[PDB]
């Protein structure tokens, strides 16, 4: 009988380990420890992926180049909202589960969001521990 907050925690945790595998994973999580968002850039098609990845399935080639993503350009792509905690208590501040993206970068980050969240809004990263927490002013 686990509720939606724990379910979402579980999904985000499962993903952490998927992203962790390999040298790109290592760059990504090391980057978070330095308050950076690290992506990788395929040299063949120029796509930039977040979280960083070591292979480009579009080109069928290894990716070797890592790039720092401009964290100030994060935006809310889509989200859902959770109004109550897992015991049924109404939250003072609803919790949002958001896909946060960056312009011209493939992928995104599944994050917790709080504030005046709406689609397209700029997101400021408050915590770089996984899963990330962002706010919308
Ligand atoms: Zn490519």
Numbering used by the authors: 8 to 144
Source paper text:
SSO2064 is the first structural representative of PF01796 (DUF35), a large prokaryotic family with a wide phylogenetic distribution. The structure reveals a novel two-domain architecture comprising an N-terminal, rubredoxin-like, zinc ribbon and a C-terminal, oligonucleotide/oligosaccharide-binding (OB) fold domain. Domain architectures, genomic context analysis and functional evidence from certain bacterial representatives of this family suggest that these proteins form a novel fatty-acid-binding component that is involved in the biosynthesis of lipids and polyketide antibiotics and that they possibly function as acyl-CoA-binding proteins. The SSO2064 gene of Sulfolobus solfataricus, a hyperthermoacidophilic crenarchaeon, encodes a protein with a molecular weight of 16.5 kDa (residues 1–144) and a calculated isoelectric point of 6.6.
The final model included residues 8–144 for chain A, residues 10–27 and 29–144 for chain B, two acetate molecules, six sulfate ions, two zinc ions and 201 water molecules in the asymmetric unit (ASU). The two molecules in th ASU are similar, with an overall Cα r.m.s.d. of 1.4 Å over 137 residues. The main differences are localized in the regions between helices H1 and H2, strands β3–β4 and strands β6–β7, which display different conformations. None of these regions are involved in crystal contacts, suggesting possible functional relevance of these conformationally flexible regions. Two N-terminal helices preceding the zinc-ribbon domain complete the structure and are involved in crystal-packing interactions. A search with PISA suggested that the likely quaternary structure of SSO2064 was either a tetramer or a dimer. However, analytical size-exclusion chromatography in combination with static light scattering strongly suggests that a monomer is likely to be the biologically relevant state of the molecule. Some of the most highly conserved residues among homologs (Pro58, Arg60, Ser82 and Thr87) line this groove, suggesting that it might serve as a binding site. We speculate that the N-terminal zinc ribbon contacts the nucleotide moiety of acyl-CoA in a manner similar to that seen in nucleic acid-binding zinc ribbons, while the hydrophobic surface of the OB fold (formed by strand β6 and loop β7–β9) could accommodate the acyl side chain. While several examples of OB-fold domains bind low-molecular-weight compounds, to our knowledge, this family appears to represent the first instance of an OB fold adapted to bind an acyl-CoA moiety.
